[PDB]
mmCIF file of N, CA and C in Angstrom:
data_model
loop_
_atom_site.group_PDB
_atom_site.id
_atom_site.type_symbol
_atom_site.label_atom_id
_atom_site.label_comp_id
_atom_site.label_asym_id
_atom_site.label_seq_id
_atom_site.Cartn_x
_atom_site.Cartn_y
_atom_site.Cartn_z
ATOM 1 N N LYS V 2 0.856 -1.224 0.000
ATOM 2 C CA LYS V 2 0.000 0.000 0.000
ATOM 3 C C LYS V 2 0.876 1.253 0.000
ATOM 4 N N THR V 3 0.533 2.246 -0.818
ATOM 5 C CA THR V 3 1.198 3.572 -0.855
ATOM 6 C C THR V 3 0.936 4.347 0.439
ATOM 7 N N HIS V 4 -0.153 4.044 1.149
ATOM 8 C CA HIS V 4 -0.454 4.697 2.449
ATOM 9 C C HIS V 4 -0.771 3.649 3.508
ATOM 10 N N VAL V 5 -0.422 3.955 4.761
ATOM 11 C CA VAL V 5 -0.610 3.038 5.918
ATOM 12 C C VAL V 5 -1.216 3.869 7.043
ATOM 13 N N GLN V 6 -2.335 3.391 7.587
ATOM 14 C CA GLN V 6 -3.013 3.987 8.758
ATOM 15 C C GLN V 6 -2.152 3.688 9.977
ATOM 16 N N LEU V 7 -1.765 4.733 10.701
ATOM 17 C CA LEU V 7 -0.980 4.611 11.953
ATOM 18 C C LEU V 7 -1.609 5.490 13.023
ATOM 19 N N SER V 8 -1.489 5.042 14.274
ATOM 20 C CA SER V 8 -1.804 5.812 15.503
ATOM 21 C C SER V 8 -0.487 6.041 16.246
ATOM 22 N N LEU V 9 -0.002 7.286 16.223
ATOM 23 C CA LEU V 9 1.329 7.663 16.760
ATOM 24 C C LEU V 9 1.174 8.138 18.189
ATOM 25 N N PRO V 10 1.909 7.529 19.143
ATOM 26 C CA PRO V 10 1.893 8.003 20.526
ATOM 27 C C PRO V 10 2.518 9.402 20.593
ATOM 28 N N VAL V 11 1.825 10.339 21.229
ATOM 29 C CA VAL V 11 2.338 11.722 21.355
ATOM 30 C C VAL V 11 3.090 11.772 22.692
ATOM 31 N N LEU V 12 4.372 12.107 22.652
ATOM 32 C CA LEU V 12 5.279 12.137 23.820
ATOM 33 C C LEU V 12 5.564 13.592 24.226
ATOM 34 N N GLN V 13 5.685 13.844 25.533
ATOM 35 C CA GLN V 13 6.217 15.122 26.067
ATOM 36 C C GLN V 13 7.727 15.123 25.809
ATOM 37 N N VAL V 14 8.260 16.228 25.283
ATOM 38 C CA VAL V 14 9.694 16.354 24.874
ATOM 39 C C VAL V 14 10.613 15.915 26.015
ATOM 40 N N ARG V 15 10.300 16.311 27.252
ATOM 41 C CA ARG V 15 11.172 16.021 28.421
ATOM 42 C C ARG V 15 11.154 14.541 28.810
ATOM 43 N N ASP V 16 10.219 13.721 28.305
ATOM 44 C CA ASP V 16 10.178 12.249 28.569
ATOM 45 C C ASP V 16 11.021 11.498 27.549
ATOM 46 N N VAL V 17 11.256 12.090 26.388
ATOM 47 C CA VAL V 17 11.925 11.375 25.281
ATOM 48 C C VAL V 17 13.347 10.958 25.659
ATOM 49 N N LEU V 18 13.602 9.650 25.615
ATOM 50 C CA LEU V 18 14.912 9.032 25.937
ATOM 51 C C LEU V 18 15.844 9.064 24.729
ATOM 52 N N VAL V 19 15.324 8.877 23.518
ATOM 53 C CA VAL V 19 16.171 8.848 22.299
ATOM 54 C C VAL V 19 15.670 9.973 21.404
ATOM 55 N N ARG V 20 16.487 11.009 21.280
ATOM 56 C CA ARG V 20 16.028 12.358 20.872
ATOM 57 C C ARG V 20 16.230 12.568 19.370
ATOM 58 N N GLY V 21 16.583 11.525 18.637
ATOM 59 C CA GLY V 21 16.618 11.600 17.168
ATOM 60 C C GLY V 21 16.846 10.245 16.581
ATOM 61 N N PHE V 22 16.874 10.158 15.254
ATOM 62 C CA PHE V 22 16.949 8.883 14.506
ATOM 63 C C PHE V 22 18.370 8.609 13.995
ATOM 64 N N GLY V 23 19.277 9.570 14.059
ATOM 65 C CA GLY V 23 20.606 9.386 13.453
ATOM 66 C C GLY V 23 21.249 10.697 13.057
ATOM 67 N N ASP V 24 22.231 10.592 12.177
ATOM 68 C CA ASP V 24 23.298 11.608 12.037
ATOM 69 C C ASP V 24 23.331 12.187 10.626
ATOM 70 N N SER V 25 22.512 11.690 9.702
ATOM 71 C CA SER V 25 22.401 12.245 8.331
ATOM 72 C C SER V 25 20.926 12.377 7.970
ATOM 73 N N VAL V 26 20.615 13.243 7.008
ATOM 74 C CA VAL V 26 19.225 13.406 6.510
ATOM 75 C C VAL V 26 18.749 12.044 6.018
ATOM 76 N N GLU V 27 19.569 11.350 5.229
ATOM 77 C CA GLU V 27 19.155 10.061 4.640
ATOM 78 C C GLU V 27 18.921 9.045 5.775
ATOM 79 N N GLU V 28 19.769 9.035 6.806
ATOM 80 C CA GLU V 28 19.650 8.016 7.888
ATOM 81 C C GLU V 28 18.386 8.273 8.717
ATOM 82 N N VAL V 29 18.077 9.526 9.026
ATOM 83 C CA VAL V 29 16.930 9.844 9.915
ATOM 84 C C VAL V 29 15.626 9.541 9.178
ATOM 85 N N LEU V 30 15.530 9.862 7.877
ATOM 86 C CA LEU V 30 14.362 9.486 7.051
ATOM 87 C C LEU V 30 14.235 7.962 6.983
ATOM 88 N N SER V 31 15.354 7.256 6.773
ATOM 89 C CA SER V 31 15.408 5.768 6.733
ATOM 90 C C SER V 31 14.873 5.195 8.044
ATOM 91 N N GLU V 32 15.505 5.604 9.147
ATOM 92 C CA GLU V 32 15.198 5.103 10.516
ATOM 93 C C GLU V 32 13.742 5.428 10.870
ATOM 94 N N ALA V 33 13.267 6.632 10.539
ATOM 95 C CA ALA V 33 11.889 7.070 10.832
ATOM 96 C C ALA V 33 10.905 6.127 10.129
ATOM 97 N N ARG V 34 11.152 5.843 8.846
ATOM 98 C CA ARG V 34 10.290 4.951 8.037
ATOM 99 C C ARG V 34 10.305 3.561 8.674
ATOM 100 N N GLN V 35 11.479 3.061 9.055
ATOM 101 C CA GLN V 35 11.573 1.724 9.702
ATOM 102 C C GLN V 35 10.751 1.715 11.010
ATOM 103 N N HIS V 36 10.912 2.725 11.870
ATOM 104 C CA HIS V 36 10.210 2.823 13.188
ATOM 105 C C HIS V 36 8.699 2.957 12.954
ATOM 106 N N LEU V 37 8.293 3.713 11.939
ATOM 107 C CA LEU V 37 6.846 3.871 11.632
ATOM 108 C C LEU V 37 6.266 2.503 11.260
ATOM 109 N N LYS V 38 6.950 1.746 10.406
ATOM 110 C CA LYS V 38 6.534 0.385 9.986
ATOM 111 C C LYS V 38 6.494 -0.539 11.215
ATOM 112 N N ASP V 39 7.492 -0.490 12.115
ATOM 113 C CA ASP V 39 7.644 -1.422 13.278
ATOM 114 C C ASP V 39 6.797 -0.977 14.485
ATOM 115 N N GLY V 40 6.046 0.116 14.357
ATOM 116 C CA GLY V 40 5.229 0.674 15.446
ATOM 117 C C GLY V 40 6.064 1.138 16.629
ATOM 118 N N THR V 41 7.297 1.563 16.388
ATOM 119 C CA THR V 41 8.234 2.043 17.437
ATOM 120 C C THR V 41 8.564 3.525 17.203
ATOM 121 N N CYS V 42 7.592 4.313 16.750
ATOM 122 C CA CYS V 42 7.809 5.737 16.403
ATOM 123 C C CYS V 42 6.856 6.589 17.230
ATOM 124 N N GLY V 43 7.393 7.614 17.885
ATOM 125 C CA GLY V 43 6.589 8.584 18.640
ATOM 126 C C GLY V 43 6.579 9.920 17.933
ATOM 127 N N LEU V 44 5.736 10.825 18.400
ATOM 128 C CA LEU V 44 5.528 12.167 17.803
ATOM 129 C C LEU V 44 5.604 13.169 18.942
ATOM 130 N N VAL V 45 6.345 14.248 18.738
ATOM 131 C CA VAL V 45 6.438 15.377 19.701
ATOM 132 C C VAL V 45 5.884 16.601 18.994
ATOM 133 N N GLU V 46 4.899 17.241 19.602
ATOM 134 C CA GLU V 46 4.243 18.429 19.021
ATOM 135 C C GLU V 46 5.196 19.599 19.225
ATOM 136 N N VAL V 47 5.362 20.393 18.179
ATOM 137 C CA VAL V 47 6.425 21.426 18.096
ATOM 138 C C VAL V 47 5.827 22.695 18.692
ATOM 139 N N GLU V 48 6.412 23.160 19.790
ATOM 140 C CA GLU V 48 6.159 24.495 20.370
ATOM 141 C C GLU V 48 7.514 25.129 20.676
ATOM 142 N N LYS V 49 7.475 26.411 21.023
ATOM 143 C CA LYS V 49 8.611 27.197 21.558
ATOM 144 C C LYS V 49 9.410 26.298 22.500
ATOM 145 N N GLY V 50 10.679 26.064 22.178
ATOM 146 C CA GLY V 50 11.669 25.425 23.063
ATOM 147 C C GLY V 50 11.769 23.926 22.868
ATOM 148 N N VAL V 51 10.897 23.333 22.051
ATOM 149 C CA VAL V 51 10.900 21.856 21.822
ATOM 150 C C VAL V 51 12.102 21.465 20.974
ATOM 151 N N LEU V 52 12.257 22.031 19.769
ATOM 152 C CA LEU V 52 13.272 21.534 18.804
ATOM 153 C C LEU V 52 14.689 21.608 19.371
ATOM 154 N N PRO V 53 15.091 22.672 20.104
ATOM 155 C CA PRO V 53 16.443 22.735 20.657
ATOM 156 C C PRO V 53 16.720 21.609 21.671
ATOM 157 N N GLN V 54 15.676 20.955 22.192
ATOM 158 C CA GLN V 54 15.806 19.823 23.143
ATOM 159 C C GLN V 54 15.906 18.495 22.384
ATOM 160 N N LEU V 55 15.734 18.508 21.060
ATOM 161 C CA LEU V 55 15.885 17.282 20.239
ATOM 162 C C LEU V 55 17.139 17.398 19.381
ATOM 163 N N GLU V 56 17.561 16.283 18.803
ATOM 164 C CA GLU V 56 18.799 16.180 18.005
ATOM 165 C C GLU V 56 18.469 16.333 16.523
ATOM 166 N N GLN V 57 19.257 17.143 15.830
ATOM 167 C CA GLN V 57 19.267 17.222 14.349
ATOM 168 C C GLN V 57 20.077 16.063 13.789
ATOM 169 N N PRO V 58 19.812 15.607 12.549
ATOM 170 C CA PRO V 58 18.684 16.094 11.752
ATOM 171 C C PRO V 58 17.316 15.724 12.353
ATOM 172 N N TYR V 59 16.334 16.618 12.219
ATOM 173 C CA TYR V 59 14.920 16.392 12.600
ATOM 174 C C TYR V 59 14.183 15.663 11.476
ATOM 175 N N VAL V 60 13.191 14.855 11.861
ATOM 176 C CA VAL V 60 12.176 14.321 10.908
ATOM 177 C C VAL V 60 10.824 14.887 11.320
ATOM 178 N N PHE V 61 10.183 15.660 10.436
ATOM 179 C CA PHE V 61 8.801 16.154 10.634
ATOM 180 C C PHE V 61 7.830 15.240 9.892
ATOM 181 N N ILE V 62 6.621 15.107 10.439
ATOM 182 C CA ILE V 62 5.416 14.767 9.631
ATOM 183 C C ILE V 62 4.686 16.065 9.305
ATOM 184 N N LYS V 63 4.357 16.209 8.024
ATOM 185 C CA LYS V 63 3.676 17.385 7.454
ATOM 186 C C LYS V 63 2.415 16.929 6.702
ATOM 187 N N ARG V 64 1.353 17.716 6.809
ATOM 188 C CA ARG V 64 0.040 17.449 6.172
ATOM 189 C C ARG V 64 0.239 17.547 4.658
ATOM 190 N N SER V 65 -0.153 16.517 3.912
ATOM 191 C CA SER V 65 0.132 16.367 2.464
ATOM 192 C C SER V 65 -1.159 16.550 1.665
ATOM 193 N N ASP V 66 -2.285 16.803 2.346
ATOM 194 C CA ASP V 66 -3.646 16.898 1.746
ATOM 195 C C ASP V 66 -4.633 17.412 2.808
ATOM 196 N N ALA V 67 -5.739 18.043 2.382
ATOM 197 C CA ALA V 67 -6.873 18.496 3.232
ATOM 198 C C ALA V 67 -8.074 17.556 3.038
ATOM 199 N N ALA V 70 -8.938 13.627 5.014
ATOM 200 C CA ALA V 70 -8.486 12.913 6.234
ATOM 201 C C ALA V 70 -9.264 11.609 6.375
ATOM 202 N N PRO V 71 -8.948 10.582 5.553
ATOM 203 C CA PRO V 71 -9.685 9.317 5.570
ATOM 204 C C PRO V 71 -9.789 8.669 6.957
ATOM 205 N N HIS V 72 -11.023 8.390 7.391
ATOM 206 C CA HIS V 72 -11.361 7.593 8.600
ATOM 207 C C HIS V 72 -10.853 8.282 9.875
ATOM 208 N N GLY V 73 -10.634 9.608 9.836
ATOM 209 C CA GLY V 73 -10.040 10.410 10.928
ATOM 210 C C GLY V 73 -8.533 10.611 10.769
ATOM 211 N N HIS V 74 -7.893 9.855 9.870
ATOM 212 C CA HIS V 74 -6.420 9.827 9.670
ATOM 213 C C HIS V 74 -5.992 10.927 8.700
ATOM 214 N N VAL V 75 -5.284 11.939 9.210
ATOM 215 C CA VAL V 75 -4.689 13.041 8.399
ATOM 216 C C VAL V 75 -3.585 12.438 7.533
ATOM 217 N N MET V 76 -3.551 12.804 6.251
ATOM 218 C CA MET V 76 -2.528 12.295 5.311
ATOM 219 C C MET V 76 -1.259 13.120 5.498
ATOM 220 N N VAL V 77 -0.143 12.436 5.686
ATOM 221 C CA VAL V 77 1.123 13.101 6.075
ATOM 222 C C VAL V 77 2.227 12.504 5.227
ATOM 223 N N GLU V 78 3.304 13.269 5.086
ATOM 224 C CA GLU V 78 4.575 12.752 4.548
ATOM 225 C C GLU V 78 5.742 13.267 5.396
ATOM 226 N N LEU V 79 6.895 12.635 5.222
ATOM 227 C CA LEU V 79 8.137 12.951 5.982
ATOM 228 C C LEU V 79 8.948 14.038 5.280
ATOM 229 N N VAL V 80 9.375 15.037 6.051
ATOM 230 C CA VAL V 80 10.408 16.037 5.663
ATOM 231 C C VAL V 80 11.495 16.100 6.744
ATOM 232 N N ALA V 81 12.762 15.979 6.364
ATOM 233 C CA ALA V 81 13.909 16.138 7.289
ATOM 234 C C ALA V 81 14.428 17.575 7.215
ATOM 235 N N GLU V 82 15.091 17.998 8.290
ATOM 236 C CA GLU V 82 15.723 19.329 8.430
ATOM 237 C C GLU V 82 17.100 19.169 9.084
ATOM 238 N N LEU V 83 18.109 19.855 8.533
ATOM 239 C CA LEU V 83 19.493 19.894 9.082
ATOM 240 C C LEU V 83 20.042 21.297 8.824
ATOM 241 N N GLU V 84 20.399 22.005 9.902
ATOM 242 C CA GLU V 84 20.988 23.373 9.880
ATOM 243 C C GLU V 84 20.131 24.277 8.989
ATOM 244 N N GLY V 85 18.801 24.205 9.174
ATOM 245 C CA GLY V 85 17.817 25.130 8.587
ATOM 246 C C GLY V 85 17.476 24.791 7.142
ATOM 247 N N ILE V 86 17.987 23.679 6.611
ATOM 248 C CA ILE V 86 17.618 23.233 5.231
ATOM 249 C C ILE V 86 16.715 22.002 5.344
ATOM 250 N N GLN V 87 15.569 22.039 4.664
ATOM 251 C CA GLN V 87 14.557 20.950 4.632
ATOM 252 C C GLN V 87 14.700 20.150 3.339
ATOM 253 N N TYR V 88 14.501 18.848 3.450
ATOM 254 C CA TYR V 88 14.631 17.864 2.346
ATOM 255 C C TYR V 88 13.251 17.254 2.167
ATOM 256 N N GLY V 89 12.533 17.834 1.209
ATOM 257 C CA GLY V 89 11.100 17.627 1.034
ATOM 258 C C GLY V 89 10.351 18.931 1.139
ATOM 259 N N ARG V 90 9.118 18.861 0.688
ATOM 260 C CA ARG V 90 8.214 20.007 0.538
ATOM 261 C C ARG V 90 6.834 19.466 0.864
ATOM 262 N N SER V 91 6.129 20.064 1.810
ATOM 263 C CA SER V 91 4.809 19.555 2.254
ATOM 264 C C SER V 91 4.095 20.663 3.019
ATOM 265 N N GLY V 92 2.958 20.342 3.639
ATOM 266 C CA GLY V 92 2.124 21.326 4.349
ATOM 267 C C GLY V 92 2.566 21.508 5.787
ATOM 268 N N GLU V 93 1.607 21.832 6.643
ATOM 269 C CA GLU V 93 1.827 22.228 8.048
ATOM 270 C C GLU V 93 2.393 21.039 8.839
ATOM 271 N N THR V 94 3.310 21.322 9.760
ATOM 272 C CA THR V 94 3.939 20.341 10.679
ATOM 273 C C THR V 94 2.906 19.847 11.698
ATOM 274 N N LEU V 95 2.717 18.532 11.777
ATOM 275 C CA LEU V 95 1.911 17.881 12.843
ATOM 276 C C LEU V 95 2.808 17.564 14.037
ATOM 277 N N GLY V 96 4.115 17.456 13.803
ATOM 278 C CA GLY V 96 5.106 17.324 14.885
ATOM 279 C C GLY V 96 6.414 16.725 14.407
ATOM 280 N N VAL V 97 7.303 16.464 15.354
ATOM 281 C CA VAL V 97 8.638 15.901 15.054
ATOM 282 C C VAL V 97 8.624 14.445 15.517
ATOM 283 N N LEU V 98 9.127 13.550 14.676
ATOM 284 C CA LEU V 98 9.180 12.109 15.002
ATOM 285 C C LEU V 98 10.430 11.798 15.818
ATOM 286 N N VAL V 99 10.297 10.816 16.713
ATOM 287 C CA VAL V 99 11.396 10.318 17.574
ATOM 288 C C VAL V 99 11.149 8.832 17.765
ATOM 289 N N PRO V 100 12.201 8.056 18.015
ATOM 290 C CA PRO V 100 12.039 6.689 18.481
ATOM 291 C C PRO V 100 11.139 6.680 19.721
ATOM 292 N N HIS V 101 10.280 5.664 19.788
ATOM 293 C CA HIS V 101 9.454 5.323 20.968
ATOM 294 C C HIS V 101 10.060 4.104 21.645
ATOM 295 N N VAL V 102 10.473 4.239 22.905
ATOM 296 C CA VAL V 102 11.107 3.124 23.660
ATOM 297 C C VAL V 102 10.342 2.892 24.972
ATOM 298 N N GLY V 103 9.023 3.116 24.986
ATOM 299 C CA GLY V 103 8.158 2.781 26.134
ATOM 300 C C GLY V 103 7.759 3.977 26.983
ATOM 301 N N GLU V 104 8.094 5.198 26.580
ATOM 302 C CA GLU V 104 7.567 6.419 27.238
ATOM 303 C C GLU V 104 6.029 6.377 27.233
ATOM 304 N N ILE V 105 5.378 6.863 28.298
ATOM 305 C CA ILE V 105 3.895 6.989 28.367
ATOM 306 C C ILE V 105 3.461 8.197 27.534
ATOM 307 N N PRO V 106 2.554 8.018 26.538
ATOM 308 C CA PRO V 106 2.084 9.144 25.745
ATOM 309 C C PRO V 106 1.051 9.988 26.498
ATOM 310 N N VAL V 107 0.790 11.186 25.980
ATOM 311 C CA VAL V 107 -0.292 12.071 26.487
ATOM 312 C C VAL V 107 -1.508 11.949 25.570
ATOM 313 N N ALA V 108 -1.326 11.420 24.358
ATOM 314 C CA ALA V 108 -2.397 11.347 23.342
ATOM 315 C C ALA V 108 -1.905 10.490 22.183
ATOM 316 N N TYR V 109 -2.783 10.258 21.225
ATOM 317 C CA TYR V 109 -2.459 9.568 19.957
ATOM 318 C C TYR V 109 -2.892 10.464 18.816
ATOM 319 N N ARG V 110 -2.104 10.481 17.744
ATOM 320 C CA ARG V 110 -2.355 11.241 16.498
ATOM 321 C C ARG V 110 -2.533 10.209 15.387
ATOM 322 N N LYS V 111 -3.772 10.034 14.921
ATOM 323 C CA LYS V 111 -4.137 9.159 13.781
ATOM 324 C C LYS V 111 -3.593 9.797 12.506
ATOM 325 N N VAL V 112 -2.744 9.088 11.771
ATOM 326 C CA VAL V 112 -2.198 9.632 10.493
ATOM 327 C C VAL V 112 -2.322 8.567 9.407
ATOM 328 N N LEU V 113 -2.420 9.020 8.159
ATOM 329 C CA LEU V 113 -2.255 8.182 6.943
ATOM 330 C C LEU V 113 -0.906 8.549 6.318
ATOM 331 N N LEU V 114 0.087 7.665 6.445
ATOM 332 C CA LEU V 114 1.494 7.929 6.044
ATOM 333 C C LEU V 114 1.695 7.489 4.596
ATOM 334 N N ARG V 115 2.009 8.430 3.707
ATOM 335 C CA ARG V 115 2.544 8.109 2.358
ATOM 336 C C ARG V 115 3.856 7.342 2.563
ATOM 337 N N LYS V 116 3.843 6.042 2.252
ATOM 338 C CA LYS V 116 4.964 5.083 2.405
ATOM 339 C C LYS V 116 5.412 4.634 1.010
#
């Protein structure tokens, strides 16, 4: 399937144990896709002071369309030193590995895979 229905655990930035996916744009996009498939991917909602507490490169989910079955359609964009790799809509949040942190909520998404 070109799209996969996922429910992403929403984590508080200060609970996150593993604060990024890796060390290159290609690696973080790779790792993010693997974690999304394996159900080991969390989402941190971006507010003032969040991103400086996470590791670059960042992986964002961005709205790719204006929402089947409640699931917002999203795609991945990475960022490193203010340059983004990809083009998409509004940020739903930043992806991080999930290693058993308790979420505050779930974000239903349809991921272009």
